[PDB]
Design a binder for this molecule. Sequence first.
Ligand SMILES: [Mg+2]
Ligand SMILES: [Mg+2]
Lengths: 142, 138, 143
Amino acid sequence: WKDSPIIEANGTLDELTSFIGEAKHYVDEEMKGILEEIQNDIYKIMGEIGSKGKIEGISEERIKWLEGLISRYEEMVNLKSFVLPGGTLESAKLDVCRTIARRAERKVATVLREFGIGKEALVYLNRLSDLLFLLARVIEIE
Amino acid sequence: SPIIEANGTLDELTSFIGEAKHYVDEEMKGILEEIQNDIYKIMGEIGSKGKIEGISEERIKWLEGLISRYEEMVNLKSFVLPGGTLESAKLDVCRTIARRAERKVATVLREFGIGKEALVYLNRLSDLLFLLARVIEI
Amino acid sequence: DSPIIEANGTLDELTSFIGEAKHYVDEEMKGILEEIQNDIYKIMGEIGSKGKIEGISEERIKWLEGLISRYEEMVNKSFVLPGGTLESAKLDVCRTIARRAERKVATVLREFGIGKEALVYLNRLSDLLFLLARVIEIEKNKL
Ligand SMILES: [Mg+2]
Ligand SMILES: [Mg+2]
């Protein structure tokens, strides 16, 4: 039963990358590239969690990468306080991914809590939902 | 914990509805958008732990009105496999997430005493989503 | 009854996602997915009735294993990112939901003693969905 945090976390991360895998077919080339890099990061996070630390996880640089994109897109979005999900068919895909990332953050927080692993992964997922939110808004603007 | 899980699931619900609304007809799209508005109201109350006002009884009556309307259009409801059509499948997905949201809010109500109306709304919402899906297939 | 309620809710989510995904695959795969929906319907009946209603037969599991063996000859599985194509992405999504369902049913078997065959079916179902996703990508690459 002690592995539940591990199994639940990876199951949710798997759901996350699979939904991102679907969403990437609804965005432009640049955004698809960003989303595939994120799938790469999730792959690394799952490796660490699934191996209970035996396999290296993500770098701190991956967190800064997200933050850089967040700063960039934040500049393009005016209204961010009162918006309902899915302004467009395409942005709806990103909002769905956004909600899964938030659920993944929670599952990973638990893993860190009981195994001390996923420290960088937790912060990465926190920022990931922020970025997915902005990407959805940008798609609606563009 | 219950508060976080509930709003996370409600967020999931409105997001999936936000996706499904682009596959239904004009009338249903409007209905789904109003539902997103209601979910927003529900998330406000749960997320503020009661400080912010939630949905009104009128919203529940609104769903019930729609349920009554679509009920008279559906003959077969007992034995149906989800997704007869792409659009109805989208709604069936929303229906299952709504049912999950109902359970999460149920916990918030028992542990925080908030969300009584929201619980009823979500109960009726899944009934409506079921009917909308069957109507589309009809 | 939470395990029962939780399991059927997730199974309902599973067949609903499969019902959506079936509109994206070819005729042969669509038929396979609809048979899977039928199997999930049977699993839900057993769980929802706490055993009163008969569940799936061992033959259904054998059915999945047969399809798994088949596709195992076409897929050579590691180091692949989900959703190579929109179609395969839909299947990958179903695969993850199936894995969640498996866990929910495991709890039911544990606490109620029902769903033994269902647990194995769900375990194997995710393996099949994974192969179906890979096959779609492989066939697309060839062209
Ligand atoms: Mg944030
Ligand atoms: Mg009901």
